Amino acid sequence: MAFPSGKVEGCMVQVTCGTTTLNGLWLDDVVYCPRHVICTSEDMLNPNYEDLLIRKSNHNFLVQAGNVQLRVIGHSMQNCVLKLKVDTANPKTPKYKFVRIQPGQTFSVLACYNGSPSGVYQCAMRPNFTIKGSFLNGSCGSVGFNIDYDCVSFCYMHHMELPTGVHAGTDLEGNFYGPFVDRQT
Ligand SMILES: *[C@H](O)[C@H](C[C@@H]1CCNC1=O)NC(=O)[C@H](CC(C)C)NC(=O)OCc1ccccc1
């Protein structure tokens, strides 16, 4: 059984850089999202993320909370996630923590597209660090979480689909679960 999603729905935004759009997680005044948002389609083959990072400015990122655009005032990279500092703190930020889960553990996923929540379901982390998700194009940045009383424990951010149809992603510090890397290879 999935957890109720209301506390997490209020944290989802859309992030666009160039023609790449995915989802971000807005907590306090930081938006967390997968770093491959800064890739064009050609970059995705063998990205040099350090080089792409230098060439971006704050105004290259478009962050929207529904119809409201949020101004980006800084950005940094932490492992495989980008952290965009915005000028507005999310007034719906729940009590939360970032946790790294173990194979065998379950968590709920709020699947989102264009910054808008679409569905909620339960997943399990397999021994090879993959999950059998229901993720389509545009789902990157969707998060996995558990609820402990009133505290939302975020444990997964979605990045990619593997050839066999299963899914891989990172914790919220941007470290992959398993030996994968964020390149379309
Ligand atoms: C981000 O929205 C997207 C999610 C994928 C697309 C298909 N289903 C998903 O879960 N991720 C990517 O496009 C990712 C980007 C790299 C720079 C990591 N590449 C990826 O998952 O491989 C391309 C692919 C597309 C469709 C089916 C299988 C693989």
Residue numbers in the entry: 6 to 190
From the paper:
To find out whether inhibitor binding to the truncated enzyme can restore the geometry of the oxyanion loop and the overall configuration of the active site to their native states, we obtained room-temperature X-ray crystal structures of MPro1–196 in complex with covalent inhibitors GC373 and NMV at 1.80 and 1.85 Å resolutions, respectively. Moreover, due to inhibitor presence, the C-termini in the MPro1–196-inhibitor complexes are better defined in the electron density maps, so we were able to model up to Gly195 (molecule B) in MPro1–196-GC373 and up to Thr196 (molecule B) in MPro1–196-NMV, the entire length of the construct at the C-terminus. A close inspection of the oxyanion loops in the MPro1–196-GC373 and MPro1–196-NMV complexes reveals that residues 139–142 adopt the native conformation in both structures. Thus, covalent inhibitor binding reverts the oxyanion loop geometry to its active configuration.
In Severe Acute Respiratory Syndrome CoronaVirus 2 (SARS-CoV-2) and its closely related SARS-CoV, a single copy of the main protease (MPro, nsp5) encoded within the polyprotein (pp) 1a and 1ab mediates its self-cleavage (autoprocessing) at its termini (nsp4/nsp5 and nsp5/nsp6) and other cleavages between nsp6 and nsp16. The fully active mature MPro is a homodimer, with one active site per monomer, and exhibits a monomer-dimer dissociation constant (Kdimer) in the low micromolar range. The active site consists of a Cys145-His41 catalytic dyad. Domains I (residues 8–101) and II (residues 102–184) exhibit a chymotrypsin-like fold, and domain III (residues 201–306), comprises a cluster of five alpha-helices connected to domain II by a long loop (residues 185–200).
